Amino acid sequence: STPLQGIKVLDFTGVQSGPSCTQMLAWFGADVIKIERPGVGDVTRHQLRDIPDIDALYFTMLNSNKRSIELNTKTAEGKEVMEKLIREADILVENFHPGAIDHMGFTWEHIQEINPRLIFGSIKGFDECSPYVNVKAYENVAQAAGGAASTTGFWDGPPLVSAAALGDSNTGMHLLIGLLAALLHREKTGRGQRVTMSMQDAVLNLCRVKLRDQQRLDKLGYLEEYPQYPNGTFGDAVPRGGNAGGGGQPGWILKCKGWETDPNAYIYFTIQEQNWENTCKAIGKPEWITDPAYSTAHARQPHIFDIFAEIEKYTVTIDKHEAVAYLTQFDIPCAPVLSMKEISLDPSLRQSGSVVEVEQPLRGKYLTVGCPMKFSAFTPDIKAAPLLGEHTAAVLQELGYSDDEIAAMKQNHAI
Amino acid sequence: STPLQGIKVLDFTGVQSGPSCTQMLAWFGADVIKIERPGVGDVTRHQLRDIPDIDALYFTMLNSNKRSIELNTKTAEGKEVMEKLIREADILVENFHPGAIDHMGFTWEHIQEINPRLIFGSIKGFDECSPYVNVKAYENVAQAAGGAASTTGFWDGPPLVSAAALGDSNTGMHLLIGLLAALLHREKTGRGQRVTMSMQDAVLNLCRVKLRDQQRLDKLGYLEEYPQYPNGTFGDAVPRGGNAGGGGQPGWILKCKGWETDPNAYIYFTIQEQNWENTCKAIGKPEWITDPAYSTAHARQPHIFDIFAEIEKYTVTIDKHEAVAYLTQFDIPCAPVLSMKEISLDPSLRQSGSVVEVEQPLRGKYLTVGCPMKFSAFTPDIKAAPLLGEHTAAVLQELGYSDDEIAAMKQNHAI
């Protein structure tokens, strides 16, 4: 049994935000029918290809386990298929521009009439009433609008985007929470509803603690743990803090052996408040244990980069993995800056199902990020991504179309 | 009606990752009973305080709607209360070090015997088989281990952490998906189960597209859309790309008027492949429309920073908001880099429920991030965070304890 056994998803999404949400739904046991433009398909199929003429990894890593149908919803036969899909569906997920579904002949009111149980999930760039309501939002557009770029990077550099998909996959995971909550709600009301999620709000949610810091700043005029305290300057907005800790425990990114030629020969190192004595023992600075200039976070803060520099004298002499194996014995919170190469090959992440090898037609093996959370009663089975239109016939057959009707729809380009 | 009406959560979490998850559970209608150490409470109550002697915003922004009980589970009476709480609960969440709950006297086995319906959610730094299992993971430690620090920042700078809580809140949102799935699964199995979520895996999941890029790099030796192509150099790992788009459409962070003294006087600007003609018109360069050195993404790539410099000649002349209002009419994807000050005061984010003003005892008003997703059939009510032990008596009363028994437990220090 799987959590979403028997749930049927009508999936119009493309790219990353919507598809990450629906791939999870598939992994949870739902039947995800991905509706794609005939002869075109989700754009990720053809972007960033590593092997000529076959689906790109962009596609395969975000569409595992889905069924692909080609359907041209602008045609009258396509419209009729869609109505039948809506009628049988538990969830419809879309990440089009406002009014796309309405213009296909299916307003929310019309959808409720066809299927009052249906849960309608929509990803947009900004919320309904926003001044940016018609910006077309890509990943980094949302990162700018949601607070992350403003607060990421260095105080003496530009706003910086994160590699992490705060606008795209993070929005998908938030929509998924909403869809799962709406399935739970449906069990009580007997009804579906519309769940909307904006990319700007997804970013903002992960930046919650920077809105903590803005209020502190408004009230006090400084942030005691930020690099700018006490010798630099605070403006009216939360500033960029480089590689600072972000919470109650300060830290930094420190160079390890190889950093001149290896851009990932680094660790993150935390000076944990309750672990100062251990930290001194690790670096061989017993004099610092009780010196009042060093014994509290308060006293450390005004010369904290001298202390990081002193720790870096140790870390530069050894490989990041060996640095972490040593430092962790002293309870120091640290880890290596693992590169995507290390992650791709890490045998532990294969064993834990975090990185998963998957067999794909025409390609052979590829790696994906697996189902992030582990369940003691359920094991996902991560499968190939569908070739374009691979499941069109099967889906139409399930709606009661004959093989001849299906062939006629292929010939007149409804599919 | 609420999505989680009638659900009871036994919540041991502190700091950010676990509390973010359970705050959302409360907002969805669950009764979240937060278990705190008598006389001390979640550390966030006293860290980064803006107002002396009352609960910090670190705490109130992450613990809205929860009930607080003070309970020493290491005592015999506290253990007996805990057993009664387990019997009544649907979900127990914890983000302690491995084995803490076992040590309390409740293995997962023993919990299953007491309450076969209970879903046990656990947040850890790393997965069970990891070499880093007993590393203490803070926010940025997980960012390092998860691939984000490696791939964020500039190619000629160090790895950079993100302001966005990739390790903390993001992990809480991923556990939340699991718990909601587990509730759904329970409707069929009649049984709870254990759901575990590591911070490393949460980071990795958002970095999924960087694993796409690693595989592309492994196969081809270069990433054609990365800043380093074609005139720079690729190594064996996906490199940092500064403010590059991260997907199929290139972009960058551009200066707007005021940038020399306003570290957030910037926009994100996407050069969308189908929108070159309009991009040229927006910046008054009609001659670039059909010039073969500019008309395609492939041709633009080797000189893309000149192109951005040229756009920047326009954007530096106007406020970032006016830049976006204009450029958007030319279909150019863009948004301001909004500061946390602008976010905190943005009337549209108030209207949309994205930033919410909450009345808190002793403090007055504070701002929080609201419930990220919107539901057409459900409106969350965000309320104050609990004062330490504010609900101890009521919780024990609901378990059948008399006032005398409760007062006796206070004097004993079991509560």
A107 interfaces chain B, CB cutoff of 8 Å? no
Which of A312, A338, A364 terminates a domain? The answer is A338
Tokens of B336: 């301001």
Look up the CATH number of the domain holding residue B118.
3.40.50.10540
A185 interfaces chain B, CB cutoff of 8 Å? yes
Instruction: Specify the pairing of strand B119-124 against strand A194-198.
Output: unpaired
Neighbours of A338 (CB within 10 A): 28
Same domain, B188 and B311: no
Distance of alpha carbon B53 from alpha carbon A260, whole angstroms: 48
**C-alpha A257, offset from chain centre:** 31
By C-alpha distance, the chain B residue nearest A3 is B185
CA-wise closest residue to B339 among A198, A197, A204, A227: A204
Instruction: Count CA atoms closer than 13 A to A236's CA, side-chain side.
Output: 9
Handedness of CA A78, A84, A86, A90 (dihedral sign): negative
* Min Cα–Cα distance to chain A from B153, Å: 7
CA-wise closest residue to B131 among A209, A193, A298, A324: A324
Three-state secondary structure of chain B: CCCCCCCEEEECCCCCHHHHHHHHHHHCCCEEEEEECCCCCCHHHCCCCCCCCCCCHHHHCCCCCCEEEECCCCCHHHHHHHHHHHHHCCEEEECCCCCHHHHHCCCHHHHHHHCCCCEEEEEECCCCCCCCCCCCCCHHHHHHHHCHHHHCCCCCCCCCCCCCCCCCHHHHHHHHHHHHHHHHHHHHHCCCCEEEEEHHHHHHHHCHHHHHHHHHHHHHCCCCCCCCCCCCCCCCCCCCCCCCCCCCCCEEEEECCCCCCCCCCEEEEECCHHHHHHHHHHCCCHHHCCCCCCCCHHHHHHHHHHHHHHHHHHHCCCCHHHHHHHHHHCCCCEEECCCHHHHHHCHHHHHCCCEEEEEECCCEEEEEECCCCEECCECCCCCCCCCCCCCHHHHHHHCCCCHHHHHHHHHHCCC
Instruction: Specify the pairing of strand A194-198 against strand A8-11.
Output: unpaired
Which of B284, B316, B338 terminates a domain? The answer is B338
Which of A338, A371, A388 terminates a domain? The answer is A338
Distance of alpha carbon B327 from alpha carbon A193, whole angstroms: 35
Residues in contact with A257: Cβ distance below 8 Å, sequence separation at least 6, in sequence order: A265, A316, A317, A318, A319, A320
The angle at the Cα of A356, spanning A391 to A177, to the nearest 5 degrees, equals 70
Same domain, B130 and B237: yes
The H-or-E segment that residue A111 falls in is helix A108-114
Distance of alpha carbon A93 from alpha carbon A187, whole angstroms: 19
B166 interfaces chain A, CB cutoff of 8 Å? yes
Neighbours of A254 (CB within 10 A): 25
DSSP A40: T
Q: What is the resolution of this structure in A?
A: 1.8
| Among candidates B16, B50, B158 on the partner chain, residue whose Cβ is nearest the Cβ of A253 | B158
Same domain, B93 and B178: yes
Q: Is A17 annotated as a binding residue?
A: yes
Same domain, B96 and B112: yes
Same domain, B355 and B264: no
Same domain, A256 and A121: no
DSSP for A275-310?
GHHHHHHHHT-GGGTT-TTTSSHHHHGGGHHHHHHH
The answer to whether the CB atoms of B158 and A243 lie below 8 A apart is yes
The answer to whether the CB atoms of A139 and B201 lie below 8 A apart is no
- What strands, in cross-sheet order, belong to the sheet with B266-270? B251-255, B266-270, B334-336
The answer to whether the CB atoms of B145 and A248 lie below 8 A apart is no
CA-wise closest residue to B95 among B205, B201, B17: B17
Same domain, A332 and A363: no
- Split into its structural domains, chain B has a count of 2
Look up the CATH number of the domain holding residue B254.
3.30.1540.10
Question: Could you tell me the CA-to-CA distances from B48 to A19, A217, A220, B19 in Å, in that order?
Answer: 39, 11, 11, 17
* Min Cα–Cα distance to chain B from A317, Å: 17
Which residues in chain B have their CB less than 8 angstroms from residue A51's CB? 219
Same domain, B327 and B367: no
Q: Are B315 and B323 in contact (CB under 8 A)?
A: yes
Residue range of the domain that includes B191: 1-241+339-415
Q: Which of A31, A55, A90, A168 is catalytic?
A: A168
Tokens of B200: 């490393």
Which residues in chain A have their CB less than 8 angstroms from residue B130's CB? 348, 352
Which structural technique was applied? X-ray
The angle at the Cα of B177, spanning B171 to B179, to the nearest 5 degrees, equals 100
Distance of alpha carbon A325 from alpha carbon A111, whole angstroms: 57
Distance of alpha carbon B317 from alpha carbon B322, whole angstroms: 10
Same domain, A288 and A236: no
A274 interfaces chain B, CB cutoff of 8 Å? no
Cis link prior to A372 (omega < 30° from 0)?
no
Amino acid occupying residue A396: L
By C-alpha distance, the chain A residue nearest B256 is A158
Distance of alpha carbon B145 from alpha carbon A384, whole angstroms: 27
Handedness of CA A97, A102, A106, A108 (dihedral sign): positive
The H-or-E segment that residue A60 falls in is helix A57-60
Distance of alpha carbon B270 from alpha carbon A145, whole angstroms: 14
Residues in binding site of B: 16-17, 37, 71-74, 95-97, 103, 136-139, 247-249, 272-274
Which residues in chain B have their CB less than 8 angstroms from residue A308's CB? none
Q: How many residues are listed for chain A in this entry?
A: 415
In terms of phi and psi (left: phi > 0; alpha: psi -120 to 50; beta: otherwise), the region of A151 is alpha
Torsion of CA A402, A404, A408, A410, to 10 degrees: 70
Residues in binding site of B for CoA: 16-17, 37, 71-74, 95-97, 103, 136-139, 272-274
Residues in contact with B44: Cβ distance below 8 Å, sequence separation at least 6, in sequence order: A248, B14, B15, B16, B19, B56, B58, B59, B62, B63
Question: Residue A390, SS3?
Answer: coil
Q: Are A163 and B163 in contact (CB under 8 A)?
A: no
Cis link prior to B230 (omega < 30° from 0)?
yes
Tokens of B244: 């590059």
Instruction: Count CA atoms closer than 13 A to A314's CA, side-chain side.
Output: 18
Buried b (16+ CB within 10 A) or exposed e, A94-119: bbbeeeebeebebeeeebbebbeebb
Same domain, A378 and A352: yes
Residues in binding site of B for substrate: 247-249
Torsion of CA A85, A29, A174, B100, to 10 degrees: 160
CA-wise closest residue to A223 among A241, A205, A208: A241
Residues in contact with B5: Cβ distance below 8 Å, sequence separation at least 6, in sequence order: A188, B29
Q: Are A389 and A38 in contact (CB under 8 A)?
A: yes
Handedness of CA A71, A77, A83, A84 (dihedral sign): negative
Which A residues, 336 through 395, put their C-beta within 8 Å of a C-beta on chain B?
Answer: 336-344, 348-349, 351-352, 354-355, 366-369, 372-378
The residue whose two tokens read 């976070």 is A297
Same domain, B167 and B56: yes
B16 interfaces chain A, CB cutoff of 8 Å? yes
Instruction: Report the DSSP beta bridge partners of residue B258.
Output: none
- Burial, B226: exposed, middle or buried (Cβ in 10 Å; 0-12, 13-18, 19+)? buried
Same domain, B307 and B189: no
Give the CA radius of gyration of chain A.
Answer: 26
Residues in contact with B398: Cβ distance below 8 Å, sequence separation at least 6, in sequence order: none
Q: In terms of DSSP H, where are the helices of A125-220?
A: 139-145, 148-151, 169-189, 199-206, 208-220
Distance of alpha carbon B161 from alpha carbon B207, whole angstroms: 13
